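Quick start: load a record and inspect it. Here is translation initiation factor 4A:
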Amino acid sequence: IQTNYDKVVYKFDDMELDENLLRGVFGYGFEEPSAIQQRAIMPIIEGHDVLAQAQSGTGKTGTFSIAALQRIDTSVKAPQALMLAPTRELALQIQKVVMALAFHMDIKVHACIGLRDAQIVVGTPGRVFDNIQRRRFRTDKIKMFILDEADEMLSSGFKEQIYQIFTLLPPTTQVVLLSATMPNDVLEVTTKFMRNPVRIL
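Running the structure step on this input writes:
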């Protein structure tokens, strides 16, 4: 584990999460934060752009799902977090988890594979870009942009769609990129859209 952020939290109780969220975490079966969640949840909540190389099954989904849910202003009924996955299956799965964690919260999650007042939007690059173009949902309230399995997405030709989505989002959007590998392409998006990112490898 290599990181340029040194805070390590061992219990979800210590992350100062909303209790309704915490209820959902424990309710989901999350007992102890994994290596990755021990280090990445906090910086994401704090607003840092975050780059994390994490293998699947290490608790990636929970990391950005918990941090995103903690950052939602439930009063605002519009997209605040946009999550991009390489496939419709992954996207569907992320929606499953987010909803389970948000069980004790009043949060609307919608998958792009209804959209106007969803607070969390999950989907594939092509579908999301198309819905933005046809103005199916506004992007002015988006505060978080999460790219799950970035190496997968950039290799499937979504690179251009992603670059375009970036430009269409508020210049102040926090960027969270998770990838198992570190292709030169991934480092590229990182240098182009992140500002002094927290790195966890």
